[PDB]
Amino acid sequence: SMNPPPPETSNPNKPKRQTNQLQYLLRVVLKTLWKHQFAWPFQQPVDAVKLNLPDYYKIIKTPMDMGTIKKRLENNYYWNAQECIQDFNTMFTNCYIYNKPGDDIVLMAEALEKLFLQKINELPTEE
Numbered sequence: 001s002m003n004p005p006p007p008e009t010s011n012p013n014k015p016k017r018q019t020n021q022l023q024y025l026l027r028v029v030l031k032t033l034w035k036h037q038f039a040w041p042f043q044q045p046v047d048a049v050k051l052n053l054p055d056y057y058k059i060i061k062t063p064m065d066m067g068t069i070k071k072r073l074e075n076n077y078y079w080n081a082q083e084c085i086q087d088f089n090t091m092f093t094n095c096y097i098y099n100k101p102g103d104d105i106v107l108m109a110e111a112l113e114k115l116f117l118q119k120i121n122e123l124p125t126e127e
């Protein structure tokens with residue numbers, strides 16, 4: 001059993017910006033999801049050795065989690081809000097790919113995804 005390297009959270013050659021929408025994705029969107037009762041399985045990269053999921057990284061090839069997103073946001077990693085939203089979408093999609101409808105973890109992702117969409121339905125205006 002071997003975990004892969006987790007996704008990067010810094011990259012000096014990547015272009016980045018500090019926009020009002022990205023600030024909101026950290027202060028409001030991420031920090032609200034983070035406190036939800038169903039958030040904890042999503043707060044760090046899947047540790048497939050700890051969790052005894054040896055097929056996880058056989059199936060999931062673009063891993064993503066809210067801990068990585070949080071550090072990317074805190075480290076000014078993104079150029080725009082769409083990039084960050086894409087990471088959220090990847091996290092949710094990975095969960096549906098690796099699992100099945102009805103699994104507890106899937107019920108958890110579905111709840112978070114609906115909350116996520118509710119929060120990004122309206123974003124602040126790129127001042």
Ligand SMILES: CCN1C(=O)c2cccc3c(S(=O)(=O)N4CCC[C@@H](O)C4)ccc1c23
Pocket residue numbers: 041042046051094095098099103104105
């Ligand atoms: C979101 C990333 N991710 C998966 O894709 C996934 C698949 C099966 C279990 C599991 C666990 S768990 O064992 O801690 N637990 C979580 C709560 C519900 C339980 O059924 C299982 C934590 C995080 C996970 C998984």
